[PDB]
Amino acid sequence: KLVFFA
């Protein structure tokens, strides 16, 4: 899994 917030 890969989750990325900006």
General shape = rod-shaped
Distance between the ends: 17 Å
Structural class: little secondary structure
What is the share of helical residues?
under 10%
Extended strand count: 0
Largest sheet: none
CA-atom Rg in angstroms = 6 Å
- How much of the polypeptide forms β-strand, as a percent range? under 5%
Question: DSSP helix count?
Answer: 0
PDB class: protein fibril
Keywords: Rippled beta sheet, amyloid fibril, protein fibril
Entry title: Racemic mixture of amyloid beta segment 16-KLVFFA-21 forms heterochiral rippled beta-sheet
Name: Racemic mixture of amyloid beta segment 16-KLVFFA-21
Description:
The chain has 6 residues and is mostly loops. The protein contains no helices and no strands. It is classed as protein fibril. Keywords: Rippled beta sheet, amyloid fibril, protein fibril. The entry is titled "Racemic mixture of amyloid beta segment 16-KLVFFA-21 forms heterochiral rippled beta-sheet". The protein: Racemic mixture of amyloid beta segment 16-KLVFFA-21.
In short:
This protein is mostly loops and 6 residues long. 0% of the residues lie in helices and 0% in strands.
